[PDB]
Design a protein around this ligand. Structure first.
Ligand SMILES: CC(=O)N[C@@H]1[C@@H](O)[C@H](O[C@@H]2O[C@H](CO)[C@@H](O[C@@H]3O[C@H](CO)[C@@H](O)[C@H](O)[C@H]3NC(C)=O)[C@H](O)[C@H]2NC(C)=O)[C@@H](CO)O[C@H]1O
Ligand SMILES: [Cl-]
Ligand SMILES: [Cl-]
Ligand code: NA
Length: 129
């Protein structure tokens, strides 16, 4: 599924991400835009042989099992394919564990380079929340 901007904002809010660990909703919408262009089916392969999955591009080296990343962890205890569903629950629940792991949203490279320090509230402008 390719989400609309306000559609995604509303879904993330319903799943408890607004101000989760101090990160306003606009941060999460901005990260999703630049990680996946709001597409739940996005995949990308890394140089080390791991793969990033879904709307928040969660990495198989650490967070999910795809059966082809030798010597990796499965810290969210889920198949990576679960992160590609049109229902964002699995992606959101795993993201909560990631952002709590020490580095906050710096775990998302595109957030650090394209969202951090910008006016992230603009990503939720006009939405009925
Ligand atoms: C969205 C996504 O998948 N992003 C990936 C990043 O998670 C990943 O960064 C590395 O993540 C691991 C686990 O969060 C980091 O280890 C943790 O680091 C903190 C602070 O040092 C420490 O408190 C934790 O104990 C430690 N947890 C474990 C299990 O070791 C690790 O430091 C991150 N490495 C870097 C360079 O940021 C990066 C790199 O694999 O890929 C993203 O796609
Ligand atoms: Cl915001
Ligand atoms: Cl933080
Ligand atoms: Na893994």
């Amino acid at each position: 599924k390719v989400f609309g901007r306000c559609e995604l904002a509303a879904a993330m809010k319903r799943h408890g991400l607004d101000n989760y660990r101090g990160y306003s909703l606009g941060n999460w919408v901005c990260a999703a835009k630049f990680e996946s262009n709001f597409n739940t089916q996005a995949t990308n392969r890394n140089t080390d042989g791991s793969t990033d999955y879904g709307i928040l591009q969660i990495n198989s080296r650490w967070w999910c099992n795809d059966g082809r990343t030798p010597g990796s962890r499965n810290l969210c205890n889920i198949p990576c394919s679960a992160l590609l569903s049109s229902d964002i629950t699995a992606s959101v629940n795993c993201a909560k564990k990631i952002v709590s792991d020490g580095n906050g949203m710096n775990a998302w490279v595109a957030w650090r380079n394209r969202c951090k320090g910008t006016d992230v509230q603009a990503w939720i402008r006009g939405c009925r929340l």
